[PDB]
């Protein structure tokens, strides 16, 4: 499972941002989720059901692949959850559908601080919210 992580990262212009993969300046609608080529992705891809879920590299058939997203055949099949977020190869946060459940609360997940560094000082709360007709428990990060 671990090497279903695409790890194509190049600090390039912005320096230092890649440290956030390991450890710890501040609005148009996103496009819908599609099939993302793994070669553009650096680190884990998260989708939100609204609860956070990691999506690993597959081929275009959905068959899992285990080559750290290094191949042209490596993709993320994101079209189904409500949205997804990831870091691209040069350090830009990408969204499709961030995972805001409230104007001031975001879904919390292991790479929130890397993908959304301007939420560093938000507080984590155990919350419950109605999505469709389905109650969900999750952890959220709020102003």
């Amino acid at each position, epitope marked *: 499972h*671990i*090497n279903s*992580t*695409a*790890l*194509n*990262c*190049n*600090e390039s212009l912005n*320096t*230092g941002w*890649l*440290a956030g*993969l*390991f*450890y710890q300046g501040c609005p148009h609608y996103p496009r819908p989720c599609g099939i993302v080529p793994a070669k553009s992705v*650096c680190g884990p891809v998260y989708c939100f059901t609204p609860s956070p879920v990691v999506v690993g590299t597959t081929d275009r058939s959905g068959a899992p692949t285990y*080559s*750290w*997203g*290094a191949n042209d055949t490596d993709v993320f099949v994101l079209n189904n959850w409500f949205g997804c977020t990831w870091m691209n190869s040069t350090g830009f946060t990408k969204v499709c559908g961030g995972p805001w459940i409230t104007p001031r609360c975001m879904v919390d997940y292991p790479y929130r601080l890397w993908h959304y560094p301007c939420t560093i000082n938000y507080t984590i709360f155990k919350v419950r919210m109605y999505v469709g007709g389905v109650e969900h428990r999750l952890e959220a990060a709020c102003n």
Partner: antibody
Amino acid sequence: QLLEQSGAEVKKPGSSVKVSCETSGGTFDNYALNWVRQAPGQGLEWIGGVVPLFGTTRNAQKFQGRVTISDDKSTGTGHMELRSLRSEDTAVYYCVRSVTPRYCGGGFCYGEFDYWGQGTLVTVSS
Amino acid sequence: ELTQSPATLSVSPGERATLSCRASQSVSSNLAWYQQKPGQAPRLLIYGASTRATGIPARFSGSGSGTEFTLTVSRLEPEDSAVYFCQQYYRSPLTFGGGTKVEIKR
């Protein structure tokens, strides 16, 4: 930050040696442990390294199959085991730790070497 | 693979020392310089071809990109007697230059 390596060693050809790399204070934030050696009169040669978060390793070709590099994230103690020692392996071995990664490519990461151990002389002799 | 020429340098205190690293193939800016004083481990001076590492005096300065790189020590002092190695982290395997040993005149 100070890296402290185990003391010098002497080994018969064909034997194995394990060198340790301990951090003076507590552990600190670093993403890779690598090992670098220097023949007594010569320059610097990269052996290999490990990125513990992903559990990946790279080795130079001269060491393919006989080196195991590992890192204890709880204690902050790293290790290089070198097997099948030959006399050409006599060298000062250096532990190095890197803090800020500069590029990654599946599934290993690379950058400058921030911190160096003081070095461990390993002599291989009959 | 990295070439440092000349392998030795002999320079007077107060003057400027210029060291050369040539890569056989582009390494872009993924190049570091280290200093190894007698009997000590190397210490990092420069990374990303031109960025000074923390705690390094400003008279150490790097430049270059691609295949041609230069470490400049301005106003040499006795403590700078050392071997200086370049190193590239552009592609695997990581490689080091052979070193230039700087002697300080007196």
